[PDB]
Amino acid sequence: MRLVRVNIDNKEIFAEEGKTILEVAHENNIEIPHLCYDKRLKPYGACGLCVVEIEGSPKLARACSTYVTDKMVIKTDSPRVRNARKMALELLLSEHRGDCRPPCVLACPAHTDCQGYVGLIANGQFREAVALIKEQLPFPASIGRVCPHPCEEACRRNMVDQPIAIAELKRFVGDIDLLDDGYIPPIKPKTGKKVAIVGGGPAGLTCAFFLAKEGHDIVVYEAMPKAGGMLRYGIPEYRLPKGILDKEIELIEKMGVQIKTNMRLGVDISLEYLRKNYDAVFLAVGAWKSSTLGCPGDSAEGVIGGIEFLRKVSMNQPVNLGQRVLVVGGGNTAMDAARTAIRLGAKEVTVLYRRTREEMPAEDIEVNEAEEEGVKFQFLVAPIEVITDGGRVRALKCQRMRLGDMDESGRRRPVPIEGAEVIFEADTIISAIGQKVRVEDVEGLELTRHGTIKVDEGTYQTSLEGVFAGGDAVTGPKIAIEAIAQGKNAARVIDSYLRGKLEPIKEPYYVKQEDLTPEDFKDRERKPRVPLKVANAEERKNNFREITSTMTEKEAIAEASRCLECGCMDYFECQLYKYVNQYDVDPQRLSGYKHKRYEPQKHPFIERNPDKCILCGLCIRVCEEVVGVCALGFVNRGFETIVKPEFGLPLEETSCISCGQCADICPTGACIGKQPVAKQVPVNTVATKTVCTFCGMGCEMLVETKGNLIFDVSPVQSNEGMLCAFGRFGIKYVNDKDRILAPLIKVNGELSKTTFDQALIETAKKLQAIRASYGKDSIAIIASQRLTNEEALLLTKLAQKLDTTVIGSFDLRESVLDRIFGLNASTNSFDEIYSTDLIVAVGKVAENHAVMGAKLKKAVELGAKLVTINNGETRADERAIATYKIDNTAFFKATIKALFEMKAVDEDYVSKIAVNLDELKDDVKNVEVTDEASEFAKIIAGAKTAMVIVDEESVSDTTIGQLANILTLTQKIGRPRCGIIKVTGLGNTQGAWDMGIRMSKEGIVKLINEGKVKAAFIVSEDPQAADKNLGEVLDKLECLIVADVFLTETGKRADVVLPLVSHVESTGTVTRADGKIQNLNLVLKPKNGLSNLDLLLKLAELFGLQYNLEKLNREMVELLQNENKYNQQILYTEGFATPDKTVHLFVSKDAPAFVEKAVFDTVKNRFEKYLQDKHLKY
Template sequence: MSKISININGRELVVSAGQTILQAAAEHGIEIPHLCHDERIQPYGACGLCVVEVEGSPKLVRSCATSVQNGQVIRTDTSRTVVARKTALQLLASDHRGDCRPPCMLACPAQTDCQGYVGLIANGQYEEALKLIKDKMPIPASIGKICPHPCETACRRELVEEPISIAQLKSFVAEVDLNGNQYQPPMKPATGKKVAVVGAGPAGLTAAYFLARDGHKVVIYEAMPHPGGMLRYGIPQYRLDKALLDAEVALMTKMGIEIIYNTKIGDDVSLDYLHDNYDAVFLGIGSWQSQGLRCKGEDMEGVLGGIDFLREVTMNSNITLGGKVLVVGGGNTAMDVARTSKRLGAEEVTIIYRRTIDEMPAEKIEIHEAQEEGVKFQLLVAPVEVLGENGHAKALKCEIMRLGEPDASGRRKPEPTGETVVYEADRIIAAIGQKTVIGNIKDIATDKSGNIIVNGGAFTTNRDKVFAGGDAVTGPKIAIDAIAQGKNAAQVIDSYLNGCLVPHADSQYFTQKDITAADLADRAKAPRVSLTVEDAEVRNKSFMQVAKTFTEEEALRESKRCLECGCRDYFECQLIKYIQDYDVSTEKDSQVECHKTTEFDNHPFIERNPDKCVLCGLCVRVCDEVVGATAIGLVGRGFDSVIMPEFKLPLSETACISCGQCVDVCPTGACMEKQVSYKQIPANMDSMASVCGYCGVGCNVNIEYKGDVVFRVTPDRVNDDGWLCQRGKFGLGHANDKARLTAPVIKRNGQFVKVDWNEANLEVVKRLQAVVAAYGKDSIGVVVSPRLTNEELFLAGKLADAVNTTIKTSYSVDGGSGLGSVLGYDASTNSFAELDNSDFVLTLGKVKENHPVLDFKIRLSGVCSVAWPQSLANTADMKVFLKALLNLGVDENKVAEKTEGFAELKASLADVKVSEEIQALAQKYAKAAKPLIVIDEDTVSAEAVKLMAYAAVITGKIGAAYRGIILVRTKNNTQGAVDMGFVMPVSAVAQGIESGKIKALVVIGEDPAAYPQESALLQKLSFLVVYDMFMTKTATAADMVVPLVSSAEVNGTYTRSDRRIQAVRAAIQPKTGKATLQILIETLKSLGIKYDTIADVRAAIASEVSNYAGMDAADFGTTVYWPNNKNVLYTDGFATEGQKAILAAVGDVPVFVEKKKYDSVEMNFVNGRQSL
């Protein structure tokens, strides 16, 4: 294609003529927003986001539908394009309904991904859950114990029965980590920058954690002897065990954070010193001064502030309470003071509060437990005077109140009645709040309340390089607020240290604010798991932690209650990305009614939500233009347009083939896959490029996973065309299957018993050696599934050698296709890539049904393609085809020169009469200059495959580019199994067992006992060892079973149907503890054959299977075909002994057959196992 020059945003670019502006920009790394464009579909221009300015054009043009022109000057980001895009996004947002992020997360000041980590806990992925939490906070175990959990207040599960115990789940998973591997976050390279953090409370610790993680050297200056701030000195031991807090802080010091204790800024070290010796300073000093009672007599001896009291208790100071203690206040601090007083021996503790118990800001559980512990409550009374003798408080005079109208807090305002009451007291403790006092810290501006003044989201103070956050800025709030301040300030400080200060700003999200209990009426009720606490009598005698951490069973049960409110597609959603990029409001106009779906489609693999649809039309067009199913379409007009399945049926009742293409092109969460994990979560997944483990088309895939759980599979659009079928898209759920075997088992006394790997290996070796010793050569058969990698198949072949047998077979392969007996190699002669440039494709068998992606490739190539008619189902019909080709004229001398048996073939066709239908088909094939025959091995007999090879040979349409046969193999590595020698017909194995010659079988990955005839045969063996992922029927009948791993857990290569060797890469670690390759290596070592690594195995393959020399290049993305990287076979003669094709007389057998499935994983998917 010719090249032209254009200019985009001042950059002079050389691009291909015929490209669109959008394509040219993308090719050079210039992003133009778009929602309705996909490279694989013709431009449509529906969304209007991709508009750009083109010099000389008065109007904005849509870059997805405008071709580049030589000399074009284009600007992609101007005030006009921004306004146009924002307008388009506002229109899309006006009718977009959903929750980008769950209510729990949005209610959390630190924006911890509650739905994410709760879902990961439900999946048993504790380490991944902890990582997700620690991406937002450093001390989850401590916070989980004491947080008032606004997340739970927002939890929609409350509309069903009770909210999820989110805080307790956080604490559970954090304690699992502290008692185990103790996760440390990945650290960025050291920047050489130093930051001083003042205060080791929640804000300071959090800021230090994130700054250290970003590579900065952090030193914390703490006024107190120990870290934690109010977590240590303001919260009693019985609520938060300080050993837990210390353990979490210790993990932070391992990150290189230094903490200098007993050092008060302004007294021991000046702020000027920090300013001059550090690149930045963060003030997180907290609010440490208790608020007074604000009444006469508050300065008397015996009156103490709540925070002061708790601090003194924590520091083991000598405190005398007396018999009667009055606590003024209604918050958690008041409850802490009252309950601590009981533990210190006070006989009577009374809380004084000016509203009713319903208005108390303290957590309900704190109030309840205080009541259980004997704390009394005097409500609707407010202090007016402290009464005393000789300067010591003896009583508190209070005015009786009544409730009026709600005030700014939303609670009913207490109003005085004029009546008073007096309460005797030995000690009065005011727990009505705290305030900030910066002390001797100089030159820092504060407001009238004493809080440090900062510049909004920049966290900057009036002094350069000095930032501030936490309670010292906001006034006293809950710990999670301070953590949020520390996290956000750290991000700003990091940007400042990197040279460009970027203030923190909250992101825009779509939220549903009108969800009611009626919307969740279909959800099954599941009671909240209650916390186990000590009895009140026990609690009052001890400062030991009163609430027990969830057990694992409790945590799993509780986490499974999550309703999964947030959109799973958040991290892939292009709409919300652009909404946030262009700062478009997601608030809805209350006067405009937004569509709301009440009935959802129950498809087994695909979840559709029309409320999130932007009507880009990509799903409709890909289903029609690429897949050819036309299962969905647009219904209605204008604002009422909606995408629905055909005839408004459920999608599962339409022509949908469950290929998932609609999911992959959808720019929002309107069309999503149902994840193959137990709990479906939105997560920023890790991804591994690999190859599909089902059929021989060998589609390239991205396996998306988190930890050891596979969540979904997406097509690899970098290394392939980007298409998948149902099996490729949705067939990897078995990797997470709870029914998987994870340890070897041996049958003893009729029951399977788990054994370790060493014992299992010893048992296999001992039993096989015993059979060989007793019965000799070929007394053992090795049966493999062609889903194994080439490396695993080679080792299975070596196992056969080690036990002195030539019996190497596969029920799935069953002797091969028949091509080898004609041409020399049992393999396709040409590559898939050649389909694009052929001029005629003849398909035979169920190519469309069994290999949809190859069907997509053929149809999208635009080549003329014809399917062999199902009506022509006998080899007699194929004989007619061969006779028709002869009648049309072939160079018989040339054919005779390049073949053996041509005369016999011709003689067997002498009396054949040609029908009009077959004559027409033969003419199309004969006239084509570049014809390819594509055969589905699953549904075409081996004899029919041979006859198609005859057709190609006698017409000379083989041995050259775009001329030959593509045999689409049954399994992902059938070709590899053939190449590694597993080609003995199964009938020969059956005869060997029947005759008593074969006494033992090693079956790897197949389930022949699923069929009665084969099951009966296996019962005649003296020893059967099965290697499989599941307890199949064959495994159940075995003497021992060794677990295999899924295709998501292997490294190696597959050889796809066109002889291309492709790298398979493990996304997750083997759930069995050992990969299949390692199992085979260890068994072979015990039998005297030594390989240590996959590299050793590949070297051996290259030596013994010469066509596979250079196979390891596939690991590096190199295209590798065997032999010698040739796309086309037989350019220099056939691979037979005399380099001639072997022809023979034609008999009568069926063309089409329905072959049984034997691969256990495929049978598992077909049978629809649901044990996630």
Template sequence: MGIIRVNINNRELTAQEGTTILKIALDNGIDIPNLCYDSRLKPYGACGVCVVEIDGIPKLQRACSTIAADGMIIKTDTARTLAARKVAFELLASDHRGDCRPPCVNACPAHTDCQGYVGLIANGQYEEAIKLVKDVIALPASLGRVCPHPCETACRRQNVDDPIAIAELKRFLGDVDINNGVFVPAVKKSTGKKVAVVGAGPAGVSCAYFLAMEGHQVVIYEAMPHPGGMLRYGIPEYRLPKDILDTEIDVLTKMGVELKYNVKLGEDVSVAYLNKAYDAVFVAIGAWASSSIGCTGQDMEGVLGGIDFLRKATQSEPIYMGNKVIVIGGGNTAMDVARTAVRLGAESVQLLYRRTRDEMPAEEIEIEEAEEEGVQFNFLVAPIEITGDGTRANAIRCQKMKLGEPDASGRRKPEPIEGEEITFDADLIVSAIGQKVDASAIQELTQTKKGTIVVNDGTFETNIEGVFAGGEAATGPKIAVEAVAQGKNAAKVINGYLNGVIIPVANPCFIIQEDLCKKDFDHVEKQNREHPVVVVPDKRKLSFSPIAETFSEEKALKEASRCLECGCHDYFECKLVNYIDKYKIDTKKISGEKHKRREEQTHPFIVRNADKCILCGQCIRACEEFIGVGAIGLEKRGFDSKVIPEFNLPLNESSCISCGQCVDVCPTGACMENEAVKKQVPVDFENVNSVCNYCGVGCNLVLQTKGDLVFKSVPDRSKEEGLLCVKGRFGINYINDESRIKTPVVTRNGSSLEVTLKEALTLTAKNLQLIKGQYGKDSVAILASPRFTNEEAFIMKKVANSLDTSFVGSMAYNDVSGMEAVLGCNASTNSYEELNSTDLIVSVGNIDENHPVMAVKIKYAAQNKGKLVSIAESKTRMEEYADLSIKPYNSTEFLKSFIKALFDGGYVNEAEVSNKAKNLENLKNYVKDAKDCGEAAKLAKMYGEAKKAIIVADDDMVTSDAYKLLADAAVITGKIGKAHSGIIVVRSSSNAQGFIDMGIKVPGKEILEQIKAGKIKAAVIIGEDPIGADYINAEILKKLEFVATFDMFMTNTALASNVVVPMGSFAESEGTITRSDRKIQKITTAIAPVNGSTVFDNLSQFGKYLDVNIASLSEAAEKLSAEIPEYAGLAVAEVEDKDIYVPNSTANTYGVQVLYTDGFNKEDKKAVLSLPENDKIFVDKKIYDSVQMKFNAYLKANGLK
């Protein structure tokens, strides 16, 4: 193909002919929105959001399906394209049912991720939950105690029973944080910028907290002697202990924030001074003045404002109360005043409210607890006059009221009952009907009629440049979390200002469900809400001690588990919500019929929601075009189109192979995975690149983690095809499995005892040394699963050497290597990449089922260039794409016929082969009597005529004798020892090739025969479960004098062992593995080891007790490189952080992709053609690895393929 030139947005670009506009744009970093595009799939053009303008073409064109032509001039973001995209997004949103964010998050003024931290609590991840809360809230323990929790008011759980106790869970987290040593957020490098914050209340503290995180130097000026604002002086001690508040605010000082007390703005320091001394100023002075009652006598001695009363009580100032206290108001402040008065010893506390109890704005729990403590409520009374004895107020005269029509607040308006009054005697009257801002001392800042500071909406800017204001100073009295939100948002704007740009804070655009009712939750099981333990009234009213206990861990876990998980689990990955916010889409602009279809969830891994589907078709196309299965399709047409499994079967009963590609390509939450945790939580994950730990294909993946849990495994789209099979995609639950062994176990005389790791390892080493000393060479065996790293395998082999045993191998090996017998090396001869350049691929075995990703590689390579032959014992999906499908009788007789046909067809240059191989004549005689077979002849013709051919063999099933004959065929036809021709052995385990290279290669059955014969007296079994696999019974292991099992789970083999040592998962490991085509890839640590030590640590320590001293991974890599010639370049490659092939060297760290280019791995460099006795081509696949066994059992239990 030729090169074309196009111009996109005035950038001159080049591309290959036949490339779409969208691909050219994306390849060059030019963003064009798209929802139905995947570079691996054919263009579809469904979503209509990628439209662009092309000079000379009047209509907008879809970039995903328009092939670029030479000389095209393209504009991506014009008025026309933006308008068209907005309409497209509005239409998509109009029938997209769901909640991008849950109601609790939307209702919280600070948009705290309630669903996120509640879910993390349910999973036992308190540290991660604390961090998530502190991304938004600086004072979780304090706010958890006092917040009136609008999040709970919005909670949809109340459609089932009661809302989630979100505030109590926040309090629980805050207390866990304090008790474990307060989490201090990371602070960025100093910017050199200084910010003054006026006021140490919720808004000021919040603003300072987030500015400090950005690396700015922050100084807080506070008028009072201590920080906290209304949290300290307006909230009684029994609700919020001040030591809790102080501990949380102290985090600011640890972040570098300086606090100056008893400094009042307008008196001790001016706005002008601060504006000159600092790069920015944030004014958050709060609302400290009490609202007036509005009746005569209100200024009399004996009348106090609610805030003044609470402040005096907090500061232990004298308050004359007498015996009778009247409190006016119906909000939480009024409750605090009344209950404080009770604790200060008032004999009678009466509360006056002009409406009824139903209209009281106070929280119901506050009202109930006030009643329990003896506060008397008088409803439908409004003050007319306060009277006194000339020196002090002693009574309040009130008008009786009735409720009329609702007012602007939605509450029924109180109206006077003509001629009806009532008088209450009082020694103290406290007005708690509201607060207001007193900014009279800072007149340079423009103020409203209500005394609040005027600020620009969304930017917090005042009339003075560089001076910002927020919290109650700007909004008037609000709940504390509103002030916290103001402070956080102001910090964001101020940070932008300090960096040269002011970006207004705006609420993101979301899709919200507003038509749900109780019927929609009929399927949810009722579960009682947890309540904190509250001190009995008669006791609690006697002091200011806390009245309620923080949730216990048990209660917190139960309560968190009640969350309905309303918010979309795909929020952090959803492309649609990102575009809706980016393009500021009004999601309610286009209204009309909206689907409401409950989806029955039958698949254990995949969750489907048709009401979030935008009909992009990616899932269908990926399943059909890419994977080649076609398990899903569209039913109906137009508005009612819906993606369904074939024949409308449940997905788990369809032909779905559970690879998860539908999930990976879905741009919304219509197709999602069940995470590998108890509680599904949409959070922003840490992404760690690693390699699948199941079969030897070595698929690249990304482990998505949060704290100490692995939530997801997704394909690494940056490498190769970006594919995983069911094992790599969903086989990670075992990592978080609570049944993992966490402590070593020693069994003596039928009794098991938990011991330390050191005790277990020293006991194992001592017993092995004793047996070696008593019985000599080869009296000890090591059986290990090839799922461990090269570095770990290297230590295992060193341990075997120390124990003087040659019996070190794995149950994963069916037999001795047939490849090695012929070629001199048990390894693939070519790389995966070469499949795309060969003329013919011969697939041997059930690769499609055992190694699905390799099957996709083969399928694509064959479709793009070459031909495909499938040889299998039974029907496989591979034959659907094969040019020739063969299901021979399971005997090597077929392969002998194949070789005979190669000779008969003239495809063997005998003179040339004689120079490269031995036994040619013997081979010719060996096959001469083979029965002629039409299929063998067809195969020979295709293989013989192909200039280049690669055989891909399934090591799970292909026998040693079959390998010998396949290698014979490759040698005699010259289709080996050169690029694009050879044999690829697809291994059963992730590092089987690496284990072979490390010298761990004795077939397990040979070791077991030696155990039965009584030659082997002790065994170390690592990660394998031969008893659980029904290969042997426990009686065989009883022949051994000592057995140690190293594993993650208490397997049947572990139960029959003397010592059991816990091991880690690949997510906790680091090192390298060698995949089936000899490419070395890196395993990266994703989470901290669950047991406190890694597999390498355990093996290193074990080796130390047997005089094998390898203390670190780097030391292992160095020694491995020095001692194993084929890995000589490993240590260098690790430093350079790159993948390499085996063999490699210090001079060639990239390694060799093609083996035998200069002869075979024999002394004379000649292959030794093999003449095996008649045997089977295939054997049944058998799994011995404990992790694979566990996952296979799960698949079987759920009826999955």
């Protein structure tokens, strides 16, 4: 080898020869875009995103294919490269039909993940929904109570029946969160920076919330006695109760924000003080100066500003109303003042608006409610005079106006009508025509002509350096969520400025669908919206009690289940979206004809969408090169190309094995794997690495969860990065709602729930009674093979405590390897498959274990020779040099005789290392050698190194013994790259056997039939469902105790049913098929709070056994060391484990070579039944 010297982006690198530019840049922290590149597949070159400019070459070179040479200067961000990538991304977008974010998210000024928390509500994850809200909205309940909800005006469900009650759902989850201790987001470590926020309103409190999250020291100066702003001294109590506001503000203060109330800028505190003692200052003073009437006599007593009147009412200060009240205005202030006056005892309240009803800035619902309460309205009427007699207002003279022409707004301009004047008698007049920023609070700042503070758009920075502004002080009176969005943006900008580099807010570019029409939803089911509970007008027009009430949990879930899931499910992991955000792509110029070919499918696991396919070919290449099924392919040619299954058939009707590799490799959400949850929702999950337990290959995986629900599973890029159908998709049982979480005991002949202590006491007493009455060896323990090593060891200890040697499993087959070699284990490891010369795959190795099929495919591609022994067709027969279809073990006897006849056995060494040889020769002396056996013997003799892969769950023990004999005769045992590997049927078969569970189904059944065994303790097995003939056998047991995840058919006939938890809720150790010890991590906490080990430890402590996880692990390590099996990659290197230290050659009579058996493990049997019902393969 030679170290090549390259230069990438003006950084000198010493890379290795034979490497692509992509690998070198990846290993040197240089980002190169790529969409059609995978490490396991040969280069394709389709997308053309990885183009880099190499000095000395005229054309841009693909980094996924070009190999680094010596003296190479590579520029991965030159303007030519940027233009090429931008054009490629624009071309890819021109044919893209998707929705990066739903219209509900885009319509919200704060861009709250409306679809996210709606879907989380539909799944029962209320705390996760609240946490998602608080990422953009610190006040879920308060804003949910008071918001015009523009998101519902843009909700796509408007096209079906009625928009989703997003505000109601947010209020519901906010109420749930506030009912208990509130949710505080994680706080970054203190940065030692002080920020001064002026104003305790939504904008200031939002800035404090999103700056304290960054670790800054936040103080909020508030002039009013209590924080809240116009959410407290504006909006009345019947629309927003102040207890909720107090609770939210207390939650904010719990984050470390110091709110100094009664401190006023310019009166109690000075701007210079803030600019000197604080790094940054954010002004959120708001518009706190109501506009005067603008007509003569506006200063007469009895005329009061709208916001001042509402502040007096809220503060419980004495206000001077009367029988007659007039309100001038049409906004929220006017309507709130009118309804407050109605509730304050005014006999008649009339609202005067210069425009008509249609142009009322207030919401229609508020106006209708006020009309119900008794407020009268006069439209097209504007004030011109205040008639006052003795310094107190007696009436007001208005000039009737009419809609004359257009105006600045563009809709309609009211103009006065000459000769039209009306006198309205009013003891009180409330001028609520709007508010303006108080000039006193904003002294020393440059003011916009409108009176608001002038700030630089995108940076929220005032004229003074280090002083920021936002909210109603900048934009004028708007809705509260706009102020919250301004506060959040200003907080982000202020954090950037404090870090040193001030960066203006950049709005991302989203792919959106604007061609949608209601005819696209003509097939969706129409569901009624959640009812709104509104207090009676007569009873509510007299008090300040809240009008609307929060929805119930059932109604909230039913409402959130109405969502259409408009946004892309792959938004948080799409790379096309990331790349189009990284480049200034203009898609409109290249927009043109776009295909619409998505048709819904019935596949329960994988969903394919042709409209979001960038035709990178990754799914086809991974189904053909790695998996080896080749169930996908290109169809048509040119612009009409589409990735389709075999003959365009549904994925279930093809040879697809539901591995999910195509979904895991797709970059742009065209192929996705459906989440194992009630409602699909695109969420940012957290991934934890654990080990699959559904067979002995022990594939590691990353379980991605959000809350207590599992949302996805991804393969680990260890080797071929592959998962089969089970590991990838059968993790759905963790979220299953049919799981039992509390024990069941038999009361009055029926199973009913109880406590864990009583159930375990009953279990112990029943076992002790059986042992006492029927003596020793009368209790059978039938444990599943998916338990950890510690649990199996604890079960063995408990069996010793019960004086019973019947410790076994119904999934356990009769052993042959321990009578030949000494240990029932695989001699070698999975790492020697690649380096062996010949592979003998016996049984349904590829069909049962898809990952092992991929491993064999890779090994044969690397140079190995494959010989498949089976009875039916196998996927490995394509690359096999020799294929044998057999049904008897006479084939192996004939092979042994052929080996002996051709003198391919060195009799001296075999007789030295293997007793029982002459009897084997005598046994094989009479069989007839066939052509197939002779060919197999010639193949074996000509191989330097040989590995025999045996599917233990579909191969009889006679075949295993004969193959062991064949390996021993040709001296292919105890050496590197030679040996026998058993692929066990369940996750921890090897560990269970090593711990002491070594009794097969037949022995236990025979003991029960004789009447020797009278009780059974079944741990997560399903004898009744898996085998019907066992139903009578279980009838012979006096006592049955079941420890299962689900209430199985065998748990319904038990006396005590104890609940187990999934393997993602239990930490421990498992053993791979080759003997490798792997760790089961804790992805989720146990749902009932008790792990399987905890339950078994309680039961054992009831018997006087003092154990824990560490002690059991130590005992397991000692047991493995005593058998010379601990951390040993190759077995029998020094000598065999038989007492003679020699091979006891397998001599027996002929028998069927392969067997078909059921699965007794509960979860695996359930998932296999599910796959059979759905007509899927694996």
